[PDB]
Amino acid sequence: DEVD
Amino acid sequence: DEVD
Amino acid sequence: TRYIPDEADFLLGMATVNNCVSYRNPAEGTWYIQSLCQSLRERCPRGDDILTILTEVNYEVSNKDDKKNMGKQMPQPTFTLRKKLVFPS
Amino acid sequence: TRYIPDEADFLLGMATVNNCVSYRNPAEGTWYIQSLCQSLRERCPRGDDILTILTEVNYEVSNKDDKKNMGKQMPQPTFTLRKKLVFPS
Amino acid sequence: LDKVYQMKSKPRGYCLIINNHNFAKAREKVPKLHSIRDRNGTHLDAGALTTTFEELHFEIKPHHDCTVEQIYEILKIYQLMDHSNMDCFICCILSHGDKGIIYGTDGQEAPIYELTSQFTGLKCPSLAGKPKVFFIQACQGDNYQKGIPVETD
Amino acid sequence: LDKVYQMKSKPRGYCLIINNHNFAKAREKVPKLHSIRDRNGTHLDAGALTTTFEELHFEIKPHHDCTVEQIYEILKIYQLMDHSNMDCFICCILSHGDKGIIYGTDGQEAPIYELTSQFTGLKCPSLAGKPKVFFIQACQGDNYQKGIPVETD
Numbered sequence: 454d455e456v457d
Numbered sequence: 458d459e460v461d
Numbered sequence: 462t463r464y465i466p467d468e469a470d471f472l473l474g475m476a477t478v479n480n481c482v483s484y485r486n487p488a489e490g491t492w493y494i495q496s497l498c499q500s501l502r503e504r505c506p507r508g509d510d511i512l513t514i515l516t517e518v519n520y521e522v523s524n525k526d527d528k529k530n531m532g533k534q535m536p537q538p539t540f541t542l543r544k545k546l547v548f549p550s
Numbered sequence: 551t552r553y554i555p556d557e558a559d560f561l562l563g564m565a566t567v568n569n570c571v572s573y574r575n576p577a578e579g580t581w582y583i584q585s586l587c588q589s590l591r592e593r594c595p596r597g598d599d600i601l602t603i604l605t606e607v608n609y610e611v612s613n614k615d616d617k618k619n620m621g622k623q624m625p626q627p628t629f630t631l632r633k634k635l636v637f638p639s
Numbered sequence: 640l641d642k643v644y645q646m647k648s649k650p651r652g653y654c655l656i657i658n659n660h661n662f663a664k665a666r667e668k669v670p671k672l673h674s675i676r677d678r679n680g681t682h683l684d685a686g687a688l689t690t691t692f693e694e695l696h697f698e699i700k701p702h703h704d705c706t707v708e709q710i711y712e713i714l715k716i717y718q719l720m721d722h723s724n725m726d727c728f729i730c731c732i733l734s735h736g737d738k739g740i741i742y743g744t745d746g747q748e749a750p751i752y753e754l755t756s757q758f759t760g761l762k763c764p765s766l767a768g769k770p771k772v773f774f775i776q777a778c779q780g781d782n783y784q785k786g787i788p789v790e791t792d
Numbered sequence: 793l794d795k796v797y798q799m800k801s802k803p804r805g806y807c808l809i810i811n812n813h814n815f816a817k818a819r820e821k822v823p824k825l826h827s828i829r830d831r832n833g834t835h836l837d838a839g840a841l842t843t844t845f846e847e848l849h850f851e852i853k854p855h856h857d858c859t860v861e862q863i864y865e866i867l868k869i870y871q872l873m874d875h876s877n878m879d880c881f882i883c884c885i886l887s888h889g890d891k892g893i894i895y896g897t898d899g900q901e902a903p904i905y906e907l908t909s910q911f912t913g914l915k916c917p918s919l920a921g922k923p924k925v926f927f928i929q930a931c932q933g934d935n936y937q938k939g940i941p942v943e944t945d
Contacts, residue, residue: 456571465760467940468567469624473775476777482782557912565927583840
């Protein structure tokens with residue numbers, strides 16, 4: 454999980 | 458015909 | 462069990478888009494609410510979902526118009542509903 | 551040949567409610583878009599309306615979770631559509 | 640085969656109705672509002688709402704000419720109630736308003752966000768996973784939505 | 793017997809796709825904004841989108857690593873096009889973002905309102921009465937949506  |  | 466987001470399952474039904482006015486007729490109520498109820502009463506029985514109903518409201522309130530100030534009203538629902546919301550009768 | 555409001559017939563599909571983050575997996579795309587397309591591909595054929603589709607997206611993205619941060623994502627559509635929007639195939 | 644919110648519950652759930660009509664106080668205290676007129680007709684909405692949702696098996700809970708203070712108070716109560724035996728919650732607000740806010744009968748402002756955020760999952764676990772509906776009837780500005788011509792539907 | 797948006801049109805309508813990946817100038821030029829990783833994966837979204845809407849008979853129109861400047865420019869074009877023989881218009885935006893805004897590949901901010909308001913009835917009569925869809929995939933803040941427990945929906 455990688456936040457925009 | 459009245460605005461809220 | 463399981464988890465869902467904090468802000469899930471919400472349905473906000475605004476009578477007007479931002480920055481604008483909504484109309485109220487002293488003799489019969491607001492365009493929005495009246496329409497909402499009208500639509501609700503004939504739709505819910507038929508088993509229609511709330512979003513569908515709200516869409517019909519959008520249609521209806523769009524055809525309405527305050528001729529004087531040559532104006533109109535645009536309702537604007539927003540939602541985080543994760544299922545179809547239906548109100549059985 | 552009637553009138554409808556200036557801002558009618560819009561459909562905004564946000565991947566996340568305000569103030570929050572949305573997720574992107576380097577290996578398979580964003581939770582939102584992927585789900586959007588998945589749902590679109592199996593729904594539209596069946597003749598399902600966009601709001602219905604968007605709701606399913608809300609469901610699905612809700613069950614997802616960023617284990618690392620224990621976080622979640624809540625999609626939030628808003629609309630002024632006056633009819634059912636369907637994408638026949 | 641589409642998921643649906645359960646809706647059998649004996650009383651279904653509460654259905655608040657903050658019905659603001661007499662904005663005289665707001666006229667007195669708030670200068671920029673020296674002229675908000677009273678919302679003549681609300682009554683008809685309130686009535687219609689009551690009837691409609693009553694027919695849908697909801698427990699109506701009216702409140703009249705509430706101030707911002709009073710509104711928050713009322714929501715606090717339902718925020719803290721136990722909705723465990725309820726399948727849904729509805730809150731209708733009939734009042735004056737402006738960009739993103741709702742006007743209290745006393746002229747004070749209530750951000751619509753402050754209102755709905757009262758019922759998140761944390762804020763009210765008894766409602767977690769249950770439809771929380773808010774109908775807000777008010778202005779969101781002083782601009783007139785202009786009309787555009789089109790073909791018949 | 794429910795009204796429905798007509799959707800027969802030969803190419804249906806355009807489907808933009810502002811696909812932002814390389815936020816190089818972002819991290820470079822915008823102080824409070826370095827470290828904002830390139831959006832590795834967008835490509836997959838863009839692909840999926842293209843395929844999906846292509847299958848739905850839409851004319852895809854990709855654009856990559858556009859800056860705010862460039863985005864506005866692109867929308868200006870379609871804003872000014874004649875969609876008379878089109879039944880719908882779609883605009884997808886894959887990029888970084890914050891509260892109510894979209895980040896340009898160069899770090900500049902674009903209010904989502906500015907984007908969608910480009911296609912109102914006045915702004916683009918060719919689309920009047922036709923669905924104008926916008927899918928925005930980006931962050932709207934740095935907070936994490938917390939989870940809450942419930943039964944099996």
